[PDB]
């Protein structure tokens, strides 16, 4: 009959608020041997590894295009990037003229038109003396003025160059993300999850899995895979999507290298501050290249077309992107301190219709040293050379398609790095536990 | 034995007769007691630079707040809110310790009990929170019965 | 080398169970509200401030609900009863319809417009009770 208010404390409910996460450490047997960009020693340890409780009978709406874990992770990867370059050496004594002529010399016969020694008057540690100093420079990192012509660097017009400290590593060590007390991360375990909509299999976790901060355009490297078949995710089905997230099931093992035994010299430009140049290449100068196995790239690219039919009925033409700048036109990645730029015009050549395995696809890769990271202007960065030969061997675990007759065309994507982080952070969000609940029962406070 | 931690060394029969000494230094004399933390704030206002000793006073305050609230919460989940010796309905399982009362209360200190029972307290705390939760449910619908 | 032993109740494990058997696990969520994974077994890093901000936030939210319990008559308790009669314009549902049939997070999305009105009436009847318990001690 008479019902009364009774309040409960410890109630399992949650809103969908957003907050400040923090990182955790993943089994690093270094324990401060070297330092890297990502400052992974500053993360917390955990004596149990992070866990996962299966929650029964609950459904929950996710939305991978309005998840704020991606925008929070994007501001953190830039923040950790700028923390490391700030104590490194400012490199203003290279804004001078660069008088040089191509290189000198069974035959080498390659790299004659993409690389040249350039001599210049540097500063010494006395600010009264000059030193005549040569250095090898890539053709991309030089600009004509007006045989031995006069050159200058790219962003000496627009920026202030700082080189990277060579002890700091660019290796993407995995980072977890953890929630403070009173918060939770809910992940979707359902295999047929298309990015948005509800989810009948949710579980809560202490921390996420290991996300590797791999920076790449047009392709996804060293990521996660798919359980079932190839999932394809766009924003909204309204013919204005323009970006497609393809997630593969089996990888396509890129192997990629630059063959050259180049050296590295140390050149003092002030009180202790040293410029690390490129001395000489020992042996035969070659191009840089990535190999793609033509067998299973043809297999993997075909399965993408099979699942694009379920969204779109038009015929499929994979055409390479055409743009001005070299960053969103090529495939940029990183091998231990070298920034490659690979022409993927042959991986995206063919057209497809509603209806080979001997060779290997070989891609021509350029390489440069002055880098405008994170689509910012004014804060260029000089990557020092690495002695010897380098070799990478990574996995294509997905790819990014930008959309531009009745025959639709998917150019290769690139540009924004937030699309790299929606590939990984799509399957979980942050909630906020509210312990006070209130409900009517038949018990009233027995007074005095 | 009177004095802070002076009963460390006596047996736990006599070390538990003077528990007020510890539950006053750890409830009163931690945050309420000091007013000289806001006498060092204006001296930090005179200098225009954040010093090293200003960071360490954050970390010694946030450790002082959390150490106070993570022992009052745990006494709040149980029925032992504002008191120092409280009894529960949890029967003592002899696989936690088979040891007799005369050996425990009269030939063993509290600091020798820390180094014996510490593997078991996470199991013991689960059974105090569960039986407190079963009690308040039972005294609600009993209340609503009459 | 580890292995899963026996299992007990876990955090949020009664979410979406029901409303009457999810109130038998109130201590399981109330244990995980103050201390998290932040507390384990050199200065001003990006990950250092972001860890310290998570510790100041976790005290401010805990003290918010713990204040609000003591303003009511319900301090140090998990289920307490008030003298505020339930008003059917807040919700008209039956007694066997919210217990044994409804879960929390379905009842949360139902009365979340009325909680600010409900909270005011619990605080008002606590002032009226404590004045009367004072004025009963004058005899």
């Amino acid at each position, epitope marked *: 009959n008479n019902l009364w208010v009774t309040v409960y404390y410890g109630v399992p409910v949650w809103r969908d608020a957003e907050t400040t996460l923090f990182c955790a450490s993943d*089994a*690093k*047997a270094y*324990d401060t041997e070297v330092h890297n960009v990502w400052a992974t020693h500053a993360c917390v*340890p*955990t*004596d*149990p*590894s992070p*866990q996962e*409780i299966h929650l029964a009978n609950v459904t929950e709406k996710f939305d991978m295009w309005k998840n704020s874990m991606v925008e929070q992770m994007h501001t953190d990867i830039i923040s950790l990037w700028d923390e490391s370059l700030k104590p490194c050496v400012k490199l203003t004594p290279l804004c001078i003229t660069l008088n040089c002529t191509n290189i000198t010399r069974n035959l080498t016969e390659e790299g004659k038109e993409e690389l040249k020694n350039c001599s210049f008057n540097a500063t010494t540690e006395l600010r009264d003396k000059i030193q005549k100093v040569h250095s090898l420079f890539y053709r991309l990192d030089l600009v004509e003025l007006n045989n031995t012509s006069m050159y200058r660097l790219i962003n000496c017009n627009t920026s202030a160059i700082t080189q990277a400290c060579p002890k700091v590593s660019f290796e993407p060590i995995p980072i977890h993300y953890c929630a403070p007390a009173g918060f939770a991360i809910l992940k979707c375990r359902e295999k047929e999850f298309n990015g948005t909509g509800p989810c009948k299999k949710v579980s809560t976790v*202490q921390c996420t899995h290991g996300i590797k901060p791999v920076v790449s355009t047009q392709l996804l490297l060293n990521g996660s895979l798919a359980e079932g078949k190839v999932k394809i995710r766009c924003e909204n089905i309204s013919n204005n999507a323009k970006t497609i997230l393809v997630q593969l099931t089996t990888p396509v093992r890129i192997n990629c290298t630059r063959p050259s035994n180049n050296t590295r010299t140390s050149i003092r430009i002030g009180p202790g501050q040293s410029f690390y140049a490129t001395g000489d290449i020992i042996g035969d100068i070659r191009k840089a290249y990535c190999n793609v196995s033509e067998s299973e790239w043809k297999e993997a690219l075909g399965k993408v077309v099979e699942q694009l039919r379920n969204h779109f009925n038009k015929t499929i033409t994979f055409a390479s992107s055409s743009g001005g700048d070299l960053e969103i036109t090529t495939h940029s990645f990183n091998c231990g301190g070298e920034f490659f730029y690979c022409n993927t015009s042959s991986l995206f050549n063919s057209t497809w219709d509603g209806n080979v395995p001997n060779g290997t696809i070989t891609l021509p890769c350029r390489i440069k040293q002055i880098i405008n990271m994170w689509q910012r202007t004014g804060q260029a960065m000089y990557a020092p050379p690495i002695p010897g030969k380098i070799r990478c061997d990574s996995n294509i675990t997905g790819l990014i398609l930008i959309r531009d007759n009745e025959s639709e065309t998917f150019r290769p994507g690139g540009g924004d790095m937030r699309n790299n982080w929606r590939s990984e952070l799509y399957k979980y969000k942050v909630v906020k536990i509210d312990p006070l609940g209130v409900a009517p029962t038949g018990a009233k406070r027995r007074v005095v | 034995l009177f004095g802070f931690l002076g009963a460390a060394g006596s047996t736990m029969g006599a070390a538990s007769l003077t528990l007020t000494v510890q539950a006053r230094q750890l409830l009163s004399g931690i945050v309420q007691q000091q007013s000289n933390l806001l006498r060092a704030i204006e001296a930090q206002q005179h200098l225009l630079r954040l010093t090293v000793w200003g960071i360490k006073q954050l970390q010694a305050r946030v450790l002082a707040v959390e150490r106070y609230l993570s022992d009052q919460q745990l006494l709040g989940i149980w029925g032992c809110s504002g008191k120092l010796i409280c009894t529960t309905n949890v029967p003592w399982n002899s696989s936690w310790s088979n040891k007799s009362q005369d050996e425990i209360w009269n030939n063993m200190t509290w600091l020798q009990w820390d180094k014996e029972i510490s*593997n*078991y307290t*996470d*199991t013991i705390y*689960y059974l105090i929170e569960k039986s407190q939760n079963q009690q308040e449910v039972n005294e609600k619908d009993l209340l609503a019965l009459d | *080398a*580890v*292995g*899963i*032993g*026996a*299992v*007990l*109740f*876990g*955090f949020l*494990g009664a979410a979406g169970s029901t409303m009457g058997a999810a109130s038998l696990t109130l201590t*399981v969520q109330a*244990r*995980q509200l103050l201390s998290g994974i932040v507390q384990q077994q050199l200065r001003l890093t990006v990950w250092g401030i972001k860890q310290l901000q998570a510790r100041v936030l976790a005290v401010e939210r805990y003290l918010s609900d713990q204040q609000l319990l003591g303003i009511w008559g319900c301090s140090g308790k998990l289920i307490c009863t008030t003298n505020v009669p339930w008003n059917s314009s807040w919700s008209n549902k039956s007694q066997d319809e919210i217990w044994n049939n409804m879960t929390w997070l379905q009842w949360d999305k139902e009365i979340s417009n009325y909680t600010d009105t409900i909270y005011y009436l619990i605080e008002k009847s606590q002032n009226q009770q404590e004045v009367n318990e004072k004025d009963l001690l004058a005899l």
Partner: antibody
Amino acid sequence: VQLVESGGGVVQPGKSVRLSCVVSDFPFSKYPMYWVRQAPGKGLEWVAAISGDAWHVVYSNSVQGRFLVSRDNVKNTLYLEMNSLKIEDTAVYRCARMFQESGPPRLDRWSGRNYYYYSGMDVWGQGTTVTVSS
Amino acid sequence: IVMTQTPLSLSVTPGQPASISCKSSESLRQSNGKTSLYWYRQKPGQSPQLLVFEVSNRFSGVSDRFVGSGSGTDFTLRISRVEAEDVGFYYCMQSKDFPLTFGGGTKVDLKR
């Protein structure tokens, strides 16, 4: 310390044996025990592992659903059953002991689970054998 | 977790130190911070015998000639001044996760 075995012999395919491993002067409720397997002219393998709690037992992948490990903390014994014996199990079966005692199960509060801890070896047994034949 | 060793057999001189290395696929650093590498010894027709029960520390009853090293996945075992009690079979064991796998196994011999 001394670790004594028995119970080994010669059987047919499709039979059941019962090995045994009696210990000497342990607490033995603190130490979880093992079973390794060495084929003739081969390297060592791992078969099974029971805890000192006698509650959580694990098996190898090849021997799953066929074996049964138990123990009696009063009698200080190990009781390895076997069922549906194949031909490739002709080897030597050694019981073993971890070099330190695992403690109690450690309750994790966030998920409500108990965890056991496993590590290496001190004392292999004498070494008894089972040879299956026709 | 797989295990591979170099070499499969040694042929050394008494009084000359040698070394045997093990290689793991996954890193064996547990969440305790301590690794899970174990160095064993089986004489022919004999029960096995522990020698080094971490990266570094030596079993109670083993002479100081056996030193251990390594971190991550690369590990070694450097015998100092090989003698007549140092022949037989040497094993690597992980205890990071089940199943508790053993290594391949070396056969240390002299030159008769």
